[PDB]
From a paper:
Surprisingly, siastatin B also inhibits both β-glucuronidases and human heparanase, which cleave β-glucuronic acid residues but not sialic acid or N-acetylated sugars. Herein, we show through crystallographic analysis of protein-inhibitor complexes that siastatin B generates both a hemiaminal and a 3-geminal diol iminosugar (3-GDI) that are, rather than the parent compound, directly responsible for enzyme inhibition. Notably, 3-GDIs are a new class of iminosugar glycoside hydrolase inhibitor, that have been shown to inhibit both GH2 and GH79 β-glucuronidases.
Unlike the three other co-complex structures, the structure of HPSE crystals soaked with siastatin B contained a 3-geminial diol iminosugar. This ketoamine can then become hydrated at the 3-position to give the observed geminal diol 8. Despite the additional hydroxyl present at the 3-position of 8, when compared to glucuronic acid, this compound appears to be well accommodated in the active site of HPSE. As well, the hydroxyl on the β-face forms a hydrogen bond with Asp62 and the backbone nitrogen of Thr97, while the hydroxyl on the α-face is positioned to form hydrogen bonds with the catalytic nucleophile Glu343 and Asp62. The hydroxyl at the 4-position of inhibitor 3 lacks the hydrogen bond with Trp391 which is seen for gluco-configured inhibitors. However, as in the costructure of 4 and BpHEP, the axial 4-hydroxyl forms a hydrogen bond with water present in the crystal structure. The presence of two additional hydrogen bonds with the active site of HPSE may be able to compensate more fully for the desolvation of an additional hydroxyl in the geminal-diol containing inhibitors. This in turn may be the reason why geminal diol inhibitor 8 is observed in HPSE, when soaked with siastatin B, instead of noeuromycin derivative 4 that is observed in the other β-glucuronidases.
Numbering used by the authors:
A (entry chain AAA): 159 to 543
B (entry chain BBB): 1 to 74
């Protein structure tokens, strides 16, 4: 199905300019399917690109291959994990001889850990683990072709992610203990997303739960498929309009800090009410060192009222509740924050993200099929200072 | 009854995520779009991308392994 294409210096400059102008750090995936007679990686094309990027002073991070578990199906070429590790060693030597000698290298961008993908990841980390800065793997919950609305709302579907994460760490801890683990490419549903689902408010349950579980379980970076593009799972549509998952991602960015804590619900069922707890993002100008950010998903069909434990039970709390703009409910492409539709001010201006101050000591209201952030002001948590 | 008590563990950080914890991709297949320069040059799109800084932007996808650098091409 997939044919070779070429790309130009112009295309590399379009990509870098976009990243540089947007304050993003570019990671560029190199072609792993360029192979010598005896099925070693042929590095000559990568050398041409490395030399061009060095010549323009482009600070770029590297990957080599995408889903190498799939090469036999996609390209009728099998590369084992041992060989792929050797290929990474050869790329690492090229980076060390380039103008950016400390450039980062990530891999191997394997699919989620089935028997044969786990085997490839294990043989890859044995062989090439020393030269990668982080281990990358990919995750999707469902086939976008067959995914249902019910699937997007089902805690039994959300929970499958936990076993994938546990299996990747089991491989990494048996081969390269302590190596950082990244989700290199992830979203709701593969094959470009679930039509009329992956681009809606309903998509946000999987996205926010995945962020929560990833942070809680030790994943250091989660890369969302895709910021912009042909797939339904895009954060920004073809008209450059932000979808609900964009707004959810912007709020997460503004409110949720680097230090991960834990929240849990005291009842025996820990299924439809999902709660996560970090220190507040120190860069949010509204908040101060020691503040907490709670985020919660309610997959019940009724409102739940959350009570904060001592010593947080009487603190001022800032609510950031997301609900769809009607009439399409969870299948809406528009979202409201505390009842205000989120929309660009103009092409250059994001809107302000207006909190709703709750009366101190009130229970936190979480409507049916909704998600919210709650900042606990003056929490004075020592772990967060 | 629809009231739920939360329990919080706050003693110490259980993990530290990157400041770029929430990162994004661009599919390598987008570079095969004739309008690639228009799309990524969009001032509207760059404003939206700046809102998620700091973050990684990973350029990759199935097409990663079907793309060849041609330094002659225009
Ligand atoms: C709502 O979901 C019900 C099962 O969930 C439980 O009952 C409801 C009323 C909530 O209190 C929730 O917290 C419980 O977990 C279903 O049996 C019922 O079919 C659904 N009701 C409606 C209106 O769709
Ligand atoms: C792409 O080119 C590589 C070598 O440069 C080759 O191995 C592969 O068969 C080509 N793929 C297709 C489907 O043309
Ligand atoms: C690698 O590919 C380049 C360009 O296609 C070719 O000139 C070179 O001979 C190849 N190297 C090996 C070892 O096959
Ligand atoms: C490249 O950028 C990283 C931040 O992503 C920076 O820490 C590193 O030192 C940079 N390398 C150079 C030489 O600019
Ligand atoms: C992995 O593939 C390489 C390259 O073809 C081969 O030389 C090696 O024997 C293979 N290892 C295993 C265990 O299959
Ligand atoms: O939507 C999908 O199925 C993705 C799977 N991984 C590679 C890719 O990002 O290019 C997509 O094809
Ligand atoms: Cl996968
Ligand atoms: Cl293998
Ligand atoms: Cl795309």
């Amino acid at each position: 199905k997939f044919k070779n294409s070429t790309y130009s210096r112009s295309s590399v400059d379009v990509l870098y300019t976009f990243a540089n102008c947007s304050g993003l750090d570019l990671i560029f995936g190199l072609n792993a399917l360029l192979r010598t007679a005896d099925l070693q990686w042929n590095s000559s094309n990568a050398q041409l690109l490395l030399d061009y990027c060095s010549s323009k002073g482009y600070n770029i991070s590297w990957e080599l291959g995408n889903e190498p578990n799939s090469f036999l199906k996609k390209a009728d070429i099998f590369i084992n994990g041992s060989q792929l590790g050797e290929d990474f060693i050869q790329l690492h030597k090229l980076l060390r001889k380039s103008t950016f000698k400390n450039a980062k290298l990530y891999g191997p961008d394997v699919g989620q850990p089935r028997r044969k993908t786990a085997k490839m990841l294990k043989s890859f980390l044995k062989a090439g683990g020393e030269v990668i800065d982080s281990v990358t793997w990919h995750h999707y919950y469902l086939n976008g072709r067959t995914a249902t609305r019910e699937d997007f709302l089902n805690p039994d579907v959300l929970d499958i992610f936990i076993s994938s994460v546990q299996k990747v760490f089991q491989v990494v801890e048996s081969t390269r203990p302590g190596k950082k683990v990244w989700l290199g490419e992830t979203s709701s549903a593969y094959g470009g997303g679930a039509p009329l689902l992956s681009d809606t408010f309903a998509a946000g349950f999987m996205w926010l739960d995945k962020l929560g579980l990833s942070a809680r379980m030790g994943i250091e970076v989660v890369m969302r498929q895709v910021f912009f593009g042909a797939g339904n799972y895009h954060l920004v549509d073809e008209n450059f309009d932000p979808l609900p998952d964009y707004w959810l991602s912007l709020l997460f960015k503004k409110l949720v800090g680097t230090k991960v804590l834990m929240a849990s619900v005291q009842g025996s069922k820990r299924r439809k009410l999902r709660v996560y707890l970090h220190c507040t993002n120190t860069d949010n100008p509204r908040y101060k060192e020691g503040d907490l950010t709670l985020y919660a998903i309610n997959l019940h069909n009724v409102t739940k009222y959350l009570r904060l434990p001592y010593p947080f039970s009487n603190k001022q709390v800032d609510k950031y509740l997301l609900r769809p703009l009607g009439p399409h409910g969870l299948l809406s492409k528009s979202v409201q924050l505390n009842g205000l539709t989120l929309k660009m001010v103009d092409d250059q201006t994001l809107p302000p993200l207006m909190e709703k101050p709750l009366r101190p000591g009130s229970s936190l209201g979480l409507p049916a099929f909704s998600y919210s952030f709650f900042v606990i002001r003056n929490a004075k948590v020592a772990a967060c200072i | 009854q629809d009231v739920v008590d939360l329990d919080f563990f706050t003693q110490e950080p259980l993990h530290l995520v990157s400041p770029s914890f929430l990162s994004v991709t661009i599919d390598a297949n987008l570079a095969t779009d004739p309008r690639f320069l228009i799309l990524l040059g969009s001032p509207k799109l760059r404003t939206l991308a700046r809102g998620l800084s700091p973050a990684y932007l990973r350029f990759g996808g199935t097409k990663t392994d079907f793309l060849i650098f041609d330094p002659k091409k225009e």
